[PDB]
Amino acid sequence: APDTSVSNKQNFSTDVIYQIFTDRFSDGNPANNPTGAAFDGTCTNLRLYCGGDWQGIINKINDGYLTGMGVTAIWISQPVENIYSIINYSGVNNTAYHGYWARDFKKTNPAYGTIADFQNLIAAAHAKNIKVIIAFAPNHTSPASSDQPSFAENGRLYDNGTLLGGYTNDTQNLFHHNGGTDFSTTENGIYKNLYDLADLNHNNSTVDVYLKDAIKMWLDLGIDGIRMDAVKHMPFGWQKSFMAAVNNYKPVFTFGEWFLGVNEVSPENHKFANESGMSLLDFRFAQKVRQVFRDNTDNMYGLKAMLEGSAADYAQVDDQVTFIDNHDMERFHASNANRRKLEQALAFTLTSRGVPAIYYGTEQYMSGGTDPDNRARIPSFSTSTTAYQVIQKLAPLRKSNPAIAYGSTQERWINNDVLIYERKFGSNVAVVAVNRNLNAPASISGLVTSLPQGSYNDVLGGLLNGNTLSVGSGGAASNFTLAAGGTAVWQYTAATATPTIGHVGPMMAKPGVTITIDGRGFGSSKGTVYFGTTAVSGADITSWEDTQIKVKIPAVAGGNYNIKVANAAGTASNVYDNFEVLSGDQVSVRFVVNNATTALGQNVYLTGSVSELGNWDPAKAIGPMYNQVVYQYPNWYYDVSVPAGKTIEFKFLKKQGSTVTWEGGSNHTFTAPSSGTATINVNWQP
């Protein structure tokens, strides 16, 4: 099958996602609607259930609303059963309409539908070439109070109907009891509760095994991707072991929600996306786009800087999920704003690197403040809005032109208000011009591109006041006027002679697992696949065609490898780096080191005899470790994904910048559990 096939669960770069807030999209089955004080059929009270369900989504898939727009993927509110409580937060009733207050990760939220309904959704979507992503929020259960067990459902967690425990009298320590986070530090936000939500303790074996078994149930139901919620608030090491469980079973595109504020560039964020096994929602992209196209707090130079910086900071920038708004922030389109601002932001996002995700209702020019005002019921299913047409015209390009899906990004023309950028992959090219100034046109002279000589029509057909482009020899474009608010897209596609890799997924797994290599120019005959210097050919290459290769990871030592392929003739492709071969199945283990004193700025890290611990390379040591919440300085702790059942030697380090101080004595040693969790507690050796 080609890279663009709906069956490709490992690559969403050729797709356009539609963010569906289930309760607010379409009530296709009034019979499953909640009743009484928990429901408002008019959807005036945005904190109660309005009735939106999976049958509704199926209907909108079948009547062409989404397909007519060029949407090829959707994500939905967490499908698992939520609490049924109607919580009164200071005179206002609140329900779990949003799906984030889970009580049973192995059952469905009856308001959205039954397991049968979910199966029907997966089937209907796939029949229309639409992939399905589910939100999954394993960070917590629901609102709770340990002193007041009668409040809500006391954050109780059930295992397919069987009660495991609640927040009160939690002798099993299924949850954290460290108060609520104040977001002061990453550690603080991980081991303390978000709001009043009962924080799950992933170091508890029951919780660990339960959640991994739960996600596998959904994987078996045929989901195509996972949107991990609140990933900045769960142990990064545990999450890596979670992604390993997923990838070593049935790998599907996974990305997490890690909020970044305006002007926030986070090295931790980058590292997480680069080493966790999942990518992230591109807040850096979203926030900059809002600054430039919505709030006028930065110009095109800032947009360019974001594009160049992110392409260098994220190992796989093409896996970051882009957007201009979501279910938490104010909708991009302000009531009194010119609609062209939204239309340009959409065009920009749809033609830029990554995986575009459009919040439901954006195309209907919905406006709204922060939660819950940004969650109104979609007011119309009109295909006649300009925004709907913009998406309809550009979304399909991610499938037809690989430069959009996998291409590099290069600024070709720029000033305060104008940015003309080029996407290029193999012989494929796309050039996009955007003039955010709604009052002043710009004279574009001296524009040079990789487009072959010829005349190019605006893919938007002038919808956003674009124009035709005339390209002479050398890719030089004839002088033209870019209209005020003008947005144009010019593109070129052609066969690529040389094998070219545009995407690889998953990027982390143990040997034997099948990975998907997408691109162009692979040829129809099986070639060779390289993991570092190791060559793979023949039987282990399950399938091979021009745009997609399915190949099993060879039994090489755990570590980071460059991926490369060669066609049957022996011509080598470009290198796709940062592939992590795991040393085997993974388990999450908590390491605790006692009496490790340090100077301000100096932190403790973990190093060891397996790749999961950096193979004794301080530059790849695990950390910085924590020392405030679960354990207190001079004691440090950290949760780490390590190969199950392996005997591992390790030591702790104290690092100040790249300056390292090693534990003295012999290495510490332990054998990781075969499944579940474990805690290894040792003393710092001088």
Ligand X SMILES: OC[C@H]1O[C@H](O[C@H]2[C@H](O)[C@@H](O)[C@@H](O[C@H]3[C@H](O)[C@@H](O)[C@@H](O[C@H]4[C@H](O)[C@@H](O)[C@@H](O[C@H]5[C@H](O)[C@@H](O)[C@@H](O[C@H]6[C@H](O)[C@@H](O)[C@@H](O[C@H]7[C@H](O)[C@@H](O)[C@H](O)O[C@@H]7CO)O[C@@H]6CO)O[C@@H]5CO)O[C@@H]4CO)O[C@@H]3CO)O[C@@H]2CO)[C@H](O)[C@@H](O)[C@@H]1O
Ligand Y SMILES: OC[C@H]1O[C@H](O[C@H]2[C@H](O)[C@@H](O)[C@@H](O)O[C@@H]2CO)[C@H](O)[C@@H](O)[C@@H]1O
Ligand Z SMILES: OC[C@H]1O[C@H](O[C@H]2[C@H](O)[C@@H](O)[C@@H](O[C@H]3[C@H](O)[C@@H](O)[C@@H](O[C@H]4[C@H](O)[C@@H](O)[C@H](O)O[C@@H]4CO)O[C@@H]3CO)O[C@@H]2CO)[C@H](O)[C@@H](O)[C@@H]1O
Is residue 163 at the binding interface for ligand Y, with CB under 6 A as the rule? Answer: no
* Interacting residues of 598 by C-beta distance below 8 A, sequence separation 6+: 604, 633, 634, 654
Cβ proximity to ligand Z, 56 vs 614, nearer residue: 614
One residue of 7, 88, 172, 185 binding ligand Z per CB under 6 A: 185
Task: Report the C-alpha gap between 173 and 165 in whole angstroms.
Answer: 9
Query: Tell me, what DSSP letter sits at residue 281?
Result: B
Residue corresponding to tokens 């979203």: 286
Task: Write down the least CB distance from residue 407 to ligand Y, Å.
Answer: 18
Q: Which stretch binds Ca ion (CB under 5 A): 49-57, 154-162, 407-415, 567-575?
A: 49-57
| Strands of the sheet with 428-435, listed across from one edge | 408-414, 418-425, 428-435, 487-492
Cβ proximity to ligand Y, 5 vs 415, nearer residue: 415
Cβ proximity to ligand Z, 268 vs 308, nearer residue: 268
Task: Write down the least CB distance from residue 235 to ligand Z, Å.
Answer: 16
One residue of 448, 494, 535, 555 binding ligand Y per CB under 6 A: 448
Is residue 472 at the binding interface for ligand Y, with CB under 6 A as the rule? Answer: no
Handedness of CA 126, 127, 130, 132 (dihedral sign): negative
Please check if 83 is assigned to a binding site: no
Site for Ca ion in 197-216 (CB under 5 A): 199
Please check if 227 is assigned to a binding site: yes
Site for ligand X in 147-186 (CB under 6 A): 147-148, 179-180
Question: Taking CB under 6 A as the rule, which mask of x and - marks residues 276-315 in contact with ligand X?
Answer: ----------------------------------------
Which one-letter amino acid corresponds to residue 675? S
Which one-letter amino acid corresponds to residue 492? Y
Tokens of residue 305, six digits = 């800087």
Cβ proximity to Ca ion, 32 vs 142, nearer residue: 32
One residue of 30, 41, 369, 446 binding ligand Y per CB under 6 A: 446
Please check if 298 is assigned to a binding site: no
Is residue 194 at the binding interface for ligand X, with CB under 6 A as the rule? Answer: yes
Is residue 628 at the binding interface for ligand Z, with CB under 6 A as the rule? Answer: yes
Please check if 139 is assigned to a binding site: yes
Q: Which stretch binds ligand Z (CB under 6 A): 211-219, 432-440, 459-467, 595-603?
A: 595-603
Task: Report the C-alpha gap between 233 and 235 in whole angstroms.
Answer: 7
> How long is the chain?
686
Whether residue 624 has a cis bond before it, omega within 30° of 0: yes
Please check if 377 is assigned to a binding site: no
Please check if 319 is assigned to a binding site: no
How many residues lie near ligand Y (CB under 6 A)? 8
Site for ligand X in 92-151 (CB under 6 A): 94, 98, 100, 137, 145-148
| β-strand pairing of 355-359 with 408-414 | unpaired
Residue 143's nearest CA partner among 153, 128, 129, 132 is 153
Q: Which stretch binds ligand Y (CB under 6 A): 424-432, 440-448, 555-563, 612-620?
A: 440-448
Options 257, 298, 343, 417, the catalytic residue: 257
Q: Are 139 and 232 in contact (CB under 8 A)?
A: no
One residue of 59, 67, 667, 683 binding ligand Z per CB under 6 A: 667
Q: Are 557 and 643 in contact (CB under 8 A)?
A: no
Q: Are 614 and 593 in contact (CB under 8 A)?
A: no
Task: Write down the least CB distance from residue 620 to ligand Z, Å.
Answer: 12
Handedness of CA 92, 95, 98, 102 (dihedral sign): positive
426: left (phi over 0), alpha (psi -120 to 50) or beta: left
* Interacting residues of 540 by C-beta distance below 8 A, sequence separation 6+: 551, 552, 554
Task: Write down the least CB distance from residue 633 to ligand Z, Å.
Answer: 4
Alpha-carbon dihedral of residues 559, 564, 568, 570, nearest 10 degrees? -110
Task: Report the C-alpha gap between 140 and 181 in whole angstroms.
Answer: 13
* Interacting residues of 240 by C-beta distance below 8 A, sequence separation 6+: 275, 276, 277, 508, 586, 641
Closest CB to Ca ion belongs to which residue? 53
Tokens of residue 349, six digits = 């996002």
Task: Report the C-alpha gap between 4 and 15 in whole angstroms.
Answer: 8
Greatest distance between any 2 Cα atoms in the chain: 76
Radius of gyration of the chain measured on its C-alpha atoms = 25
Task: Report the C-alpha gap between 577 and 617 in whole angstroms.
Answer: 19
Is residue 610 at the binding interface for ligand X, with CB under 6 A as the rule? Answer: no
Tokens of residue 372, six digits = 């819950």
Cβ proximity to ligand Z, 161 vs 601, nearer residue: 601
Q: Which does 53 bind (CB under 5 to 8 A by kind): ligand X, ligand Z, Ca ion, none?
A: Ca ion
Task: Report the C-alpha gap between 357 and 9 in whole angstroms.
Answer: 16
Site for ligand Y in 322-341 (CB under 6 A): none
Task: Write down the least CB distance from residue 536 to Ca ion, Å.
Answer: 20
Element (H, E) at 124: helix 115-127
Is residue 454 at the binding interface for ligand Y, with CB under 6 A as the rule? Answer: no
C-alpha of 87 from chain center: 30
Cβ proximity to Ca ion, 481 vs 562, nearer residue: 562
Task: Report the C-alpha gap between 255 and 225 in whole angstroms.
Answer: 8
Q: Which stretch binds ligand Y (CB under 6 A): 162-170, 329-337, 381-389, 443-451?
A: 443-451
Active-site annotation holds for 257: yes
Q: Which does 603 bind (CB under 5 to 8 A by kind): ligand Z, ligand Y, ligand X, none?
A: ligand Z
Q: Which does 396 bind (CB under 5 to 8 A by kind): ligand Z, ligand Y, Ca ion, none?
A: none
Helix/strand/coil (H/E/C) assignment for every residue in 8-42: CCCCCCCCCEEEECHHHCCCCCHHHCCCHHHECCC
Task: Write down the least CB distance from residue 452 to Ca ion, Å.
Answer: 28
Please check if 333 is assigned to a binding site: no
Q: Which stretch binds ligand Z (CB under 6 A): 7-15, 33-41, 482-490, 598-606?
A: 598-606
* Nearest-5° Cα angle at 272, 267 to 273: 100
Is residue 413 at the binding interface for ligand Y, with CB under 6 A as the rule? Answer: yes
How many residues lie near ligand Z (CB under 6 A)? 15
One residue of 315, 350, 358, 509 binding Ca ion per CB under 5 A: 315
How many residues lie near Ca ion (CB under 5 A)? 11
Q: Are 478 and 507 in contact (CB under 8 A)?
A: no
SS3 55: helix
Is residue 7 at the binding interface for ligand Z, with CB under 6 A as the rule? Answer: no
Is residue 603 at the binding interface for ligand Z, with CB under 6 A as the rule? Answer: yes
Active-site annotation holds for 229: yes
Cβ proximity to ligand X, 121 vs 281, nearer residue: 281
End-to-end CA distance of the chain: 58
Is residue 616 at the binding interface for ligand Z, with CB under 6 A as the rule? Answer: yes
Task: Write down the least CB distance from residue 233 to ligand X, Å.
Answer: 8
Tokens of residue 352, six digits = 């830029």
Q: For binding to ligand Y (CB under 6 A), which residues are involved? A: 411-415, 445-446, 448
Which residues are part of a known binding site for substrate? 100-101, 140, 145-147, 193-196, 227, 232-233, 327, 371, 375
Q: For binding to Ca ion (CB under 5 A), which residues are involved? A: 27, 29, 32-33, 51, 53, 139, 199, 233, 315, 577
Which residues are part of a known binding site for Ca(2+)? 27, 29, 32-33, 51, 53, 139, 190, 199, 233, 315, 577
Q: For binding to ligand X (CB under 6 A), which residues are involved? A: 89, 94, 98, 100, 137, 145-148, 179-180, 193-197, 229-230, 257, 327-328, 371
Q: For binding to ligand Z (CB under 6 A), which residues are involved? A: 185, 598-603, 616, 627-628, 633, 651, 662, 664, 667
Catalytic positions, please?
A: 229, 257
